[PDB]
């Protein structure tokens, strides 16, 4: 009945323009109804119309847009996706950069298929007043995405260092140890031994004990991945890594649990 009403109104009143000319609040309500009914085509049309009218939709409605997009195609990001996931983001460009809720950022974290793709993403978070809480929410997923790309230790090592020096302004100093250890876990892999060596002394974590099985797991993954990447281990070889192996090691593990 509602669809029949909409068609009759649009066809009779004026065929050259749809209901988008109505008062924006009604357009927002229509967008909410369509999302609750999962009409993505109509939702994108009305949302594109709202943006051109200089109207900022409410955060919850945009989040409902995101979840409707996710549930329409059972999510499950893959090679086939993204491009299909696109065509529903054009009208959202004004709300990225300027404004931008945390749900939006988390929605776009996975769709960045390249490090340089997310370079602008992290740049505009750093330029947003919501940088601290958004980083708090989306850093782990960000770590997974950045590690997914840049398989080679060198290029991802440089990428991680760049993210480090651009996030250091965030939170000023005394970053919570949760992100320090989370970064180190994703950083113990590959190389950059020296900068993590600096990192332990930089902050007051000074925890050589087992990271609840994670430190030795990280070393195990590194040596397992050593065959695939960093085979030469220029600078990362045991001939160099010996000093760091014997530097940070708790009494709980007998020489890194004799690996």
């Amino acid at each position: 009945a509602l669809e029949n009403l909409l068609a009759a109104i649009n066809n009779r009143f004026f065929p050259g323009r749809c209901e988008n000319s109505l008062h924006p609040i009604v357009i927002e309500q229509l967008l909410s109804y369509f999302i609750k009914t999962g009409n993505l085509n109509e939702s994108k049309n009305f949302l594109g119309h709202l943006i051109k009218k200089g109207i900022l939709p409410e955060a919850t409605i945009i989040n409902r847009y995101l979840e409707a997009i996710d549930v329409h195609f059972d999510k499950s990001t893959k090679i086939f996706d993204i491009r299909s996931k696109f065509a529903f983001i054009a009208d959202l460009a004004p709300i990225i950069e300027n404004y931008g809720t945390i749900d939006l950022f988390k929605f776009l974290i996975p769709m960045c298929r390249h490090f340089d793709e997310l370079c602008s993403l992290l740049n505009i978070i750093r330029k947003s007043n919501n940088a601290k809480r958004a980083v708090d929410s989306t850093l782990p997923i960000f770590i997974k995405k950045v590690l997914t790309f840049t398989k080679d230790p060198m290029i991802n090592s440089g990428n991680l260092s760049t993210v480090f020096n651009i996030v250091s302004p965030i939170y000023g100093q005394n970053v919570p140890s949760e992100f320090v250890e989370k970064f180190i876990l994703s950083f113990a892999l590959q190389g950059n031994y020296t900068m993590m060596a600096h990192m332990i002394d930089t902050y007051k974590i000074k925890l050589s004990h087992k990271y609840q099985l994670q430190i030795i797991r990280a070393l195990k993954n590194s040596e397992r991945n050593h065959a695939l990447k960093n085979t030469g281990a220029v600078g990362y070889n045991k001939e160099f890594k010996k000093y760091f192996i014997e530097k940070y090691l708790n009494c709980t593990e007998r020489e890194a649990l004799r690996p």
Partner: protein
Amino acid sequence: IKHADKVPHPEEIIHPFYQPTAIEQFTACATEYNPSLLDGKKIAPSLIKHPVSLKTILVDSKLKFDDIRGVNKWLMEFVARRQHQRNIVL
């Protein structure tokens, strides 16, 4: 020979937050051997018109400049659009 994946104009390409920095534009302009954007990653959903299918098919493109002339115009035109989109307030 098959299609060469000719670069489309910035109007076709749709990306919310891809801001091309100055340094990458200089990189594209200074390249003389098949320049490209995003290192030719084939990630650029483009509202492109195929020669036999002019139906605004959406497909990621290489964004690889076959030639060198006009690429600079491409960069200024793209950045102009992105700045315009960024400027508008809601």
